[PDB]
Amino acid sequence: WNPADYGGIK
């Protein structure tokens, strides 16, 4: 969920 996972692409 961190910004280099969910906040990046989705």
Q: In the numeric block, which tokens belong to residue 7?
A: 């906040």
In whole angstroms, what is the distance from residue 4 CA to residue 7 CA?
A: 6
Tell me how far apart the alpha carbons of residues 3 and 10 are, in angstroms, rounded to a whole number.
Answer: 10
Whole-number Å distance between alpha carbons of 5 and 8:
5
What are 4's two structure tokens? 């280099």
The secondary structure of the chain as a DSSP string is: --TTTTTTT-
Cα-to-chain-centroid distance, residue 9: 6
Q: What does the alpha-carbon distance between residue 2 and residue 10 come to, in Å, rounded to a whole number?
A: 11
In sequence order, the 6+-apart residues with CB closer than 8 A to the CB of 5 are: none
* Whole-angstrom distance, CA of residue 9 vs CA of residue 6: 6
Experimental method used, please? NMR
Cα–Cα distance measured from residue 10 to residue 6, given in angstroms and rounded to the nearest whole number: 5
